[PDB]
Amino acid sequence: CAWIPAKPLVQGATTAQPIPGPVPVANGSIFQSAQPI
Amino acid sequence: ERIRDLTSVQGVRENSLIGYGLVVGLDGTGDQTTQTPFTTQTLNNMLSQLGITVPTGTNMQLKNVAAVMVTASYPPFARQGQTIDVVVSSMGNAKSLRGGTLLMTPLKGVDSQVYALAQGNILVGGVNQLNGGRITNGAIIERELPTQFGAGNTINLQLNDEDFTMAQQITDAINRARGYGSATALDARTVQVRVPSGNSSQVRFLADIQNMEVNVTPQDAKVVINSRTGSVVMNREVTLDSCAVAQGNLSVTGGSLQSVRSSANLNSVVRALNALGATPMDLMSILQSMQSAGCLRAKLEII
Amino acid sequence: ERIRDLTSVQGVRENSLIGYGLVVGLDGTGDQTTQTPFTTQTLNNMLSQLGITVPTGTNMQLKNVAAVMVTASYPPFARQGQTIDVVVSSMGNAKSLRGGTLLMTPLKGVDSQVYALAQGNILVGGVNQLNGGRITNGAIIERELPTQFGAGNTINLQLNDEDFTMAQQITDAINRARGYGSATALDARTVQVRVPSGNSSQVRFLADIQNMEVNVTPQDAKVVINSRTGSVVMNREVTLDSCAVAQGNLSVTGGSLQSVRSSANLNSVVRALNALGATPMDLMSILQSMQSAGCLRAKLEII
Amino acid sequence: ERIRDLTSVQGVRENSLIGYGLVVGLDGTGDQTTQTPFTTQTLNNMLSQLGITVPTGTNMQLKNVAAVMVTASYPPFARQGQTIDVVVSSMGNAKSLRGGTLLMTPLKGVDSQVYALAQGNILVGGVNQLNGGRITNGAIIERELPTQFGAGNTINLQLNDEDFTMAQQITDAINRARGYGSATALDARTVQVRVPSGNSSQVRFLADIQNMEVNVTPQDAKVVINSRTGSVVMNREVTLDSCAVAQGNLSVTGGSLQSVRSSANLNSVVRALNALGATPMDLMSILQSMQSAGCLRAKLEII
Amino acid sequence: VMLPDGTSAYTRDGSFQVDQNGQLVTAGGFQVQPAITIPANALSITIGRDGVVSVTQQGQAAPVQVGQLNLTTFMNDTGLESIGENLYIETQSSGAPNESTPGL
Amino acid sequence: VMLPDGTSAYTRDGSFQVDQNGQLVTAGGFQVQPAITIPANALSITIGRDGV
């Protein structure tokens, strides 16, 4: 009865790969902000 | 020299660099290191890097070492190997930084990347500040920033102070000595100039542009009041209207209500306001009340 | 001598070297060594290297030994066997380094590699700093850096201060005494020169270039204020506009609002500002308020 | 004598030697030996070597013995049997080394090999340092270093200070009195000379080279400030621009803002800076502020 | 101890107090060189035989030290000038004040 | 007894304590030369008539 396939409570992926960030613009500044929310 | 003193070039800007370091060689005027654990922690880190591993459980009570923050400006078009000045400021319970030496300090940017390496001897004045100093050529640039200078046929001159009249005047001045359509104003603060394609060509063009002289046009009437320092500054375009002013312990020299003569130029304004015999602390309140009433025909800013 | 005093050569730069050492021979003015365990630990390391193994459990309470950090500059094109000056700074609770001797100290780079070996006698002034000294020719270079000098046909002169006019002026000066296309400006801070292929040829070319004299062009108007030392410095291109200044305990010598005459050159500015009778501490606030209002036609920097 | 005073020969360099020893014969001004166990441990080692085995469990409380570190320079082309000077520095809680005698001390190199043996009488000045002395001809060389001198047809002269103009000038001077292609500059700091194959031939060639006189060319403008000793030194190539200087308690002798006249040569600079009536402590801050503003046309170094 | 003028005085009264910024000062408030800063986490302050100032804290089996109390020794103690407020100064006699850690 | 400065003193107070590294010391913390290191696993210390 413990061998019956079951759906977990927290479905899906339990990890997220950090997304690489945008390439800085060529404006002469060190501060570069990604697409602001 | 007017255009360079009035505007700035697009993309030619200074960044800010920050880092943490240690200052050694102080005459017993460093951190207590019992209330600033980071000083001893970073000293132990430096020793461990250099090849000395001090035991974890031990008491170090230093007196010649201070933990400091170093700040600098990354200049436009900085190339690796050049030197810049840095400012060294103590961070915890240090008495002085008189004759200390800044050890190797990496100056990070906003992106937390090392753009300069700082190390040198601090110069402290000697009523002078003791926990703050400056090192001339104390940091060497290690990273360069890519730029778009030399690409495209447009360059923006950004006015330091926004003014439609001044923007139009710079546009007309560039378009008088450099061709018909060499400049177009985009807003109250930006003048777009057409530059030849290339890198040295734009350098030559901007060298020509920068030293041109423009006739500065009347620029708003404003009275700046600094209450924290107790100072008042009025520019030339400040005027007055005839109205009566009363304030404590001030009287006609004979009642307490003194008539202030309408005034057209700045000399008239100064004479009329000095006729009241008002201390600048009283003069600030007088100016604020007159701005409320409407006698003062200027923009009152409190800085 | 203008080009050498204004620019620097690409790849000809100074690095920073750091190391840890011990200073011996002090007249009882060394570390307490009970609050600085690294002093005794490194002394025991030195003895163990030299052939003396002091027991681990023992109390050493020295008075003539101080743990110090040594800093130096690795000069351009340094060759092994040459000597450089070092700066010796105490690191923990040492009273003085008057007549101490720096023992063998390896000066590491940023890459944690030994580039110099330091050992010598410290010279301490003798209000003078006691925990900081300098040793002339105190370190010998042990490692050399490869370089690309002599390879390629381009050399970059990097201006110390960015200026399109100055870059163009250096470009035109190099292109007057050294051929038509011998120099091209790349940005406000870089002038690219074409050099013959080879090593001695580039040395000869740069020797010619460096001593050339360029006519320095007007360079921005700026007022530098150092509040930590209480100093104000204004260059020649600073001007003023007519406006009224009021500040505490300052009066016309008769109200508190003093008119400052418009000023074209620096002598006029100095006379107008001295007419106010302002202490430099008051003058700093006056200049800041005038910059806010708009009378001061210069760039106010606080250093 | 210019070439010898300006350059150094490749491979002709001085090394650093270090060793540990005991100084005996002091008038009760040695280590306490209760806080410096290595003194008694090494004395017992010396006695055991000489044939006296003191019991392990015993209390020795000496007063005429001090543990010292000896430092020396290994000279170029040193041969065994020659004598060198050594510096003797106390290592732990010793009052003085007035009339002590240095016992047999092996001076190790970086490679931990004995290159000299040191033993002699210490000369201490007698405000004089008491824990540091010097022994002239106090060490005898015991090991020699192999060298490549006399092999090959190239010898590098390494300039003490890097300069393309000076390197080119030395190259042209060697190539005037010693043939057409006798010297070639490799970088700002190295001049490669072609020497005959052999050992005495190169000695003769370098003897000729070393005493030649070269006309020293203008060498950068720099202001050296030593804040730890409170000294300022300006070389001949330092100039000034006209600008106004204000600092605390300094006034025209009549406001606080004093105009500094543009200055071309060093005498003009000295007169203009003395017109301010500034103490060197104030002069350091003035120079730093002027370097920030741009009046000071020199390289400000803080040593 | 350090006088307000900046010159050093010498006292034998052993009553000290920690002021609002640590620092052991005399009853008159004059600071007691060589400067001793006491942390606020102190549970007990111990001044040792050799002048070692150790401070115990919470969650730290090992007492945290603070500094050394150095004594000044003169060669003619009769010769010091009595300023008044329990302070002696070096006169032409009793010169060369010799600093030393207590016990030696 | 060995004083901290290294000189030897003499006492008739026989109240001794083991310090944190073994060792018999006086109640004031001064060590009792000739030195005596007491091991950790000690079940009993015995001082005999002949000082052993």
UniProtKB/Swiss-Prot annotation, chain A:
A lipid is attached at residue 1 (S-diacylglycerol cysteine). It comes from the Bacteria. Coiled coil: none annotated. A lipid is attached at residue 1 (N-palmitoyl cysteine). It is found in: Cell outer membrane; Bacterial flagellum basal body. The basal body constitutes a major portion of the flagellar organelle and consists of four rings (L,P,S, and M) mounted on a central rod. Assembles around the rod to form the L-ring and probably protects the motor/basal body from shearing forces during rotation. Belongs to the FlgH family. This is Flagellar L-ring protein. The gene is flgH. The chain holds residues 22 to 58 of 232 of the full protein.
Curated annotation (Swiss-Prot), chains B, C, D:
Its main location: periplasm. Coiled coil: none annotated. The keyword Signal applies. It comes from the Bacteria. Keywords: Bacterial flagellum, Periplasm, Signal. GO terms for biological process: bacterial-type flagellum-dependent cell motility. One of its GO terms (cellular component) is bacterial-type flagellum basal body, distal rod, P ring. One of its GO terms (molecular function) is structural molecule activity. It is found in: Periplasm; Bacterial flagellum basal body. The keyword NAD does not apply. PANTHER family: FLAGELLAR P-RING PERIPLASMIC PROTEIN FLGI (PTHR30381), FLAGELLAR P-RING PROTEIN (PTHR30381:SF0). HAMAP family: FlgI. Belongs to the FlgI family. The basal body constitutes a major portion of the flagellar organelle and consists of four rings (L,P,S, and M) mounted on a central rod. Assembles around the rod to form the L-ring and probably protects the motor/basal body from shearing forces during rotation. This is Flagellar P-ring protein. It comes from Salmonella typhimurium (strain LT2 / SGSC1412 / ATCC 700720).
From Swiss-Prot, chain F:
This is Flagellar basal-body rod protein FlgG. The chain holds residues 105 to 156 of 260 of the full protein. The basal body constitutes a major portion of the flagellar organelle and consists of four rings (L,P,S, and M) mounted on a central rod. The rod consists of about 26 subunits of FlgG in the distal portion, and FlgB, FlgC and FlgF are thought to build up the proximal portion of the rod with about 6 subunits each. It comes from Salmonella typhimurium (strain LT2 / SGSC1412 / ATCC 700720). Disulfide bonds: none annotated. Belongs to the flagella basal body rod proteins family. It is found in: Bacterial flagellum basal body.
